[PDB]
Structure 1
Amino acid sequence: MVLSEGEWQLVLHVWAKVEADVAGHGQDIFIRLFKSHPETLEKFDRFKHLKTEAEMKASEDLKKHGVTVLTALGAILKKKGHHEAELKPLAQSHATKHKIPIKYLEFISEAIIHVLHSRHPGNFGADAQGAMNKALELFRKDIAAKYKELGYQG
């Protein structure tokens, strides 16, 4: 797929709001993910002992990890589709070290869209949500193609 510039504009306009509090957005997203799809928590050896949302919010390691993840995602979105280099090391570690299936990348995509919708309703109407969804579908389709080249296609 190819997003138009107007779509990329809608995505970087709400992303600029997220960047005003990257650590708080990271927490909300991961908490939403772990609550909605508990199986994804099992993939994290560092965090799978966390039993409640209260424990998750209080985890300083989880908040540092959410900042790492959103920073890497933001760098990919700011490329506007020219993200081949950024995607390489990310696809290698998620396919060969962490073993994350594409279906889990759909689950975090849903969590990102839920949290933007809750926190940024004015900058996340139907058109802006449709553009963010297109941008995350492009990221998932490109990562899935790299998984296949690396031998995992999971």
Structure 2
Amino acid sequence: GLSDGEWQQVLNVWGKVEADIAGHGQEVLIRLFTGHPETLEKFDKFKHLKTEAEMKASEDLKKHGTVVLTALGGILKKKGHHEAELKPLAQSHATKHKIPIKYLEFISDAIIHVLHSKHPGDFGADAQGAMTKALELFRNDIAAKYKELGFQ
């Protein structure tokens, strides 16, 4: 449950991401994969990436980063009214990709890390609070769908 002012902060922060969705998406995934190498194993199409240099050079990783952040941005712009947008992602990530909710926590924190890394001094405490709450809401609603599906 975010206030109007918190959603305003979220969407203000998101404008930073939308200016360079592929660069943000790439860095989010690289942060996820390098911080939590087990997550790489969930991607048949990225498990060949042995080094961060290879990850950085991967155009397909940037492409997927764009897909991920485009989806997330579409969800965030719903300001919590995202059941229709979230449902297929929860279902695909539980049933097809088999992504534990822990990895969604990892990527949520990776987003925060990337925002500070790319916008140092420009991702204020209020913005971090609002973005964190929005990612918690996202993760929590996914978690509810995971529970429905019995997925761990």
Give the structure-2-normalised TM-score. 0.97
Point out where structure 1 has 5 or more consecutive residues left out of the alignment. none
1:49-64 pair list within 5 angstroms: 49-64=48-63
1:45-124 pair list within 5 angstroms: 45-124=44-123
CA distance in 2 between counterparts of 1:19 and 1:97 reads: 28
List per-residue Cα deviations over 1:40-77 (Å, max 9, x = no partner). Answer: 10110111010111101111111111000000000000
Matched residues, number: 152
Question: Which residue in the other structure is 2:138 paired with?
Answer: 139
CA distance in 2 between counterparts of 1:17 and 1:133 reads: 15
How far residue 122 of structure 1 moved from its aligned partner, in angstroms, is: 4.1
Question: Which residue in the other structure is 2:8 paired with?
Answer: 9
Secondary structure of 1:121's aligned partner: coil
CA distance in 2 between counterparts of 1:90 and 1:103 reads: 15
How far residue 148 of structure 1 moved from its aligned partner, in angstroms, is: 1.5
List per-residue Cα deviations over 1:95-131 (Å, max 9, x = no partner). Answer: 0000000110000011100001111234411111011
CA distance in 2 between counterparts of 1:80 and 1:55 reads: 36
Confirm or deny: 8 A CA contact 1:41 1:47 kept in the other structure: yes
Question: Which residue in the other structure is 1:29 paired with?
Answer: 28
In structure 2, give the amino acid aligned to 1:54. A
CA distance in 1 between counterparts of 2:28 and 2:125 reads: 20
CA distance in 2 between counterparts of 1:27 and 1:96 reads: 25
Confirm or deny: 8 A CA contact 1:13 1:123 kept in the other structure: no
Secondary structure of 1:81's aligned partner: coil
Runs of 4+ in 1 over 6 A off after TM superposition: none
Give the structure-1-normalised TM-score. 0.96
